């Protein structure tokens, strides 16, 4: 099972492609909202609970999936090139698995490979989307989902 969506942070910044494997978060006005990245959210096998739901986040219009890997021995968010013929899988590789958390009517995406690290945005305009360890501080970890047809 899969669904197409757009994700916006709690400060209402939209997510856009910034490079071949880079995403940035910025406020987009009116007609420019068509620029927001379309995500392919797949429900994968893993640790299930009332608080956490395992998901895989693909770029839908790209052969890319959000991945968590060690870069300079620090958990880092990346966009990994994949073969669309083989993806989405029911049993997805750990690095691609995210725990979808429902907070106060908002969504959180925790890394399964690196627990307590979340998909994050800066408070600042036009900064890269990254994996952040802090929850309830500098980094924004809360998101709103908008379904696309």
């Amino acid at each position: 099972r899969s669904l197409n969506c757009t994700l916006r942070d709690s400060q209402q910044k939209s997510l856009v492609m910034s490079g071949p494997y880079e995403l940035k978060a910025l406020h987009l006005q009116g007609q420019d909202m068509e620029q927001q990245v379309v995500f392919s959210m797949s429900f994968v096998q893993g640790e299930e609970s009332n608080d956490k739901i395992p998901v895989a986040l693909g770029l839908k219009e790209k052969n890319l999936y959000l991945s968590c890997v060690l870069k300079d021995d620090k958990p880092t968010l990346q966009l990994e090139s994949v073969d669309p013929k083989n993806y989405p899988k029911k049993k997805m590789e750990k690095r691609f698995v995210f725990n979808k958390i429902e907070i106060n009517n908002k969504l959180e995406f925790e890394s399964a490979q690196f627990p307590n690290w979340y998909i994050s945005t800066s408070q600042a305009e036009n900064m890269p989307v990254f994996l952040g360890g802090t929850k309830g501080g500098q980094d924004i970890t809360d998101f709103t989902m908008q379904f696309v047809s």
Partner: antibody
Amino acid sequence: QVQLVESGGGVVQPGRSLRLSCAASGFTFSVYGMNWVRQAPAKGLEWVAIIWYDGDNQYYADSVKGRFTISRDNSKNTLYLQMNGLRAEDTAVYYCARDLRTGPFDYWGQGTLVTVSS
Amino acid sequence: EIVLTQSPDFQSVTPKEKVTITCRASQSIGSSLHWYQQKPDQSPKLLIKYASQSFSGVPSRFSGSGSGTDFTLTINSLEAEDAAAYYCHQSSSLPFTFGPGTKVDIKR
């Protein structure tokens, strides 16, 4: 609404350089990716280069990589193409093109002809 | 790079009839396949975006279909003005590539 106007096309000797520019209007230039697409006389379309909205990242076709440079000026709504080490095979109409979500080329300019010969 | 094979290179079709042109990708591109029309002495124009979505201002007679490697552009009720070149382009991965093109001849 959307308008893309190319300039700088003309004659350039093989091995020499030429700089193209594209004036954009009728949309928020600073939030859209810009591209160069070329077409040799009586031939098909070939994607040259892309520059993302903020100008931080660029990507090139294998045929132009290391010779051509794509740049933009968001304060002047202009896209540029710096073409160096030009060869006869580079003769083409060079189109300025906007992309939607780094996907389809939704708006195109009128194109500018670059003739590479002696 | 992903190689796009466009079939046929040329097609002569009776007016008011259907034209079917295929685009084949060397690797799976999902739904990131776009269609363009180029009329003589004109710049190319977007027809179909993301395999099946008609672009703003494009008539209903132009339709797109496909996923993965095989993609089709269908022109229902063929008109004289449709005598042009048609191109497929993939945006799934970099470098972006185009198919070699198809020329459509109207059989009068």
